[PDB]
Structure 1
Amino acid sequence: HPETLVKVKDAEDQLGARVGYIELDLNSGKILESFRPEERFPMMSTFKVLLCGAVLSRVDAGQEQLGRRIHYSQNDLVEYSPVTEKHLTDGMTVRELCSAAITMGDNTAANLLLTTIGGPKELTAFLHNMGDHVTRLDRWEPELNEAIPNDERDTTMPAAMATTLRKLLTGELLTLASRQQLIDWMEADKVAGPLLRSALPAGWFIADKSGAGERGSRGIIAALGPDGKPSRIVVIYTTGSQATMDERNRQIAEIGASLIKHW
């Protein structure tokens, strides 16, 4: 609804920055509303959903096992690794790593998973192969959040990320078991509380993943809907703002409130 574009433009005014937005119908794949659909934005941690989709694809192909234990050391630890820092001597299974990366935003878990699938190069190839010709991962954790202006490394386009998420959650790319596991990890997302979840009516469903990076970068990808079932995908990205984290969060929540109001 254009009233939601009013809120997207209002966010650009309040944040002094570009905001990208897509509302997509989950069933059909039709774009219901958009703003800067084909401009690039840093993905930040939202790439972790794509990463775990690539891991699940490998599990489906018999190239990986969710129960395989991965061992690592102090050397692999990077900033903000809440779960992995507690298992240095126990190691963690692939499944536990994806859960940590998506639900707890664990950065080391993401880097360990990246290594298992062949790194940024292979994730980019996986994406191109499933039809996303613009999303690209080039670096590893902490560096992929650098968000240098005009840099295309580690970026996506709102329209591309939205359709890619629809393909992963409801397309034929992953098996039914894997699709459900991916959305279950997203539904247990515990670090995106101040974003779309804060504007979600009671009883609604949401599976999401948020990201934050340098230079005011902030974003979220989500599948949501009434009655405990997802029916639309929403992607919101912003970069370039000098505003506080609370301000950026408030603006994203307001765009969410508007899309719920005009649902």
Structure 2
Amino acid sequence: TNLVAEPFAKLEQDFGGSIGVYAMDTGSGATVSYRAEERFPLCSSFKGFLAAAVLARSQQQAGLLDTPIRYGKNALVPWSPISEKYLTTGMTVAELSAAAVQYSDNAAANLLLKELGGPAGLTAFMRSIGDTTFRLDRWELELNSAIPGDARDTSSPRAVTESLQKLTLGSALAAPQRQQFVDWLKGNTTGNHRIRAAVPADWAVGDKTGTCGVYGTANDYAVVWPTGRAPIVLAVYTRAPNKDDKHSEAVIAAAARLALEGLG
């Protein structure tokens, strides 16, 4: 019997799909795990890890983050509001990274993927930090298909949380780069109704959302700084069996609340 899990099971059943949750209290090592090792599509949530990989590269390449990239219209993709805005002026690597993280900008994400050697290059970066679960296989927008049983472009809530911890709190990035990653996540604009909706208003939150949309597939991961407490790192992912099943932000927020409540 798993009593801790029961509210998560009820929540996913009402949702009509599966919810995956992993939360870590970095002070005590306490966790809350529900389907934590199952795979879920990354959707736009990969863009946080993409930005981290760019930051890692920027450690050894002087002025990389400050480098202007002058892309053309052929680089644009639907839902690239920042990239379109700066088409006539260009954007720095840092600005593209921030756009990918904070506005889920698709053109920015593809541009940065190209610099890293594509989906395989991002995957190699994740392997280099000890994440053997993460895989990115395709580019925007094809990576969002979220087909049940398809492992392409997936990770697990546990691996997402473990990697997020390494990159934001651990030693996977040098300190100045770690802090930049945190600053970008904290400035995310797309997550107000997800993990952020579950946390007390006074707590700092950095997050990245994903919304494949199809197959009820959406997610959010976050690092949370509780007033007067060690940070919490958590990941909440959803999916559902049928193509036109709707995702739910409310379900993500509700799962995040239960995770915070269940943590030592």
Task: Name the TM tier (shorter chain).
Answer: over 0.9
Q: Contact 2:44/2:210 (CA < 8 Å) preserved in 1?
A: yes
2:116 corresponds to: 117
Map residues 217-236 of structure 1 onto 2, 5 A cutoff.
217-227=217-227, 231-236=231-236
1:92 corresponds to: 91
Please state how far the C-alpha of 1:244 moved relative to its aligned partner: 3.5
**Matches of 2:131 and 2:122 in 1, distance apart?**
11
Segments of 4+ moved more than 4 angstroms: none
| 1:204 equivalent in alignment to 2:198 | no
Normalised by the length of structure 1, the TM-score is 0.92
Q: Which runs of 5+ in 2 are unaligned?
A: none
Q: Contact 2:236/2:256 (CA < 8 Å) preserved in 1?
A: no
Map residues 1-263 of structure 1 onto 2, 5 A cutoff.
5-27=5-27, 30=29, 32-62=31-61, 65-213=64-212, 214-227=214-227, 231-240=231-240, 242-245=244-247, 248-263=248-263
Q: Which runs of 5+ in 1 are unaligned?
A: none
Q: Contact 2:116/2:122 (CA < 8 Å) preserved in 1?
A: yes
Q: Contact 1:204/1:229 (CA < 8 Å) preserved in 2?
A: no
Q: State, as a whole percentage, how many aligned pairs show the same letter.
A: 39
Deviates most, 139-148 or 195-204: 195-204
Letter paired with 2:40: F
CA RMSD across the alignment: 1.8
- Map Cα deviations across residues 222-262 of structure 1 (whole Å, 9 max, x no partner): 111321776111101111265534xx111111122223444
Q: Contact 2:70/2:89 (CA < 8 Å) preserved in 1?
A: yes
Please state how far the C-alpha of 1:6 moved relative to its aligned partner: 2.9
**Matches of 2:127 and 2:63 in 1, distance apart?**
21
Structure 1 residues 64 and 154: alpha-carbon distance in aligned structure 2, compared to 1, 3 A threshold: farther
Letter paired with 2:60: A
Size of the aligned set, in residue pairs, is: 259
**Matches of 1:126 and 1:64 in 2, distance apart?**
20
**Matches of 1:3 and 1:90 in 2, distance apart?**
56
**Matches of 2:186 and 2:103 in 1, distance apart?**
12
**Matches of 1:27 and 1:109 in 2, distance apart?**
35
Q: Contact 1:18/1:239 (CA < 8 Å) preserved in 2?
A: yes
Letter paired with 2:128: N
Please state how far the C-alpha of 1:7 moved relative to its aligned partner: 3.0
**Matches of 2:61 and 2:72 in 1, distance apart?**
27
SS at match of 1:223: strand
Deviates most, 63-72 or 12-21: 63-72
**Matches of 1:3 and 1:174 in 2, distance apart?**
38
Normalised by the length of structure 2, the TM-score is 0.92
Q: Contact 1:22/1:31 (CA < 8 Å) preserved in 2?
A: no
- Map Cα deviations across residues 157-202 of structure 1 (whole Å, 9 max, x no partner): 1111110111111221211000000011000111111111122212
Structure 1 residues 84 and 115: alpha-carbon distance in aligned structure 2, compared to 1, 3 A threshold: same
Letter paired with 1:244: K
SS at match of 1:8: helix
SS at match of 2:215: coil
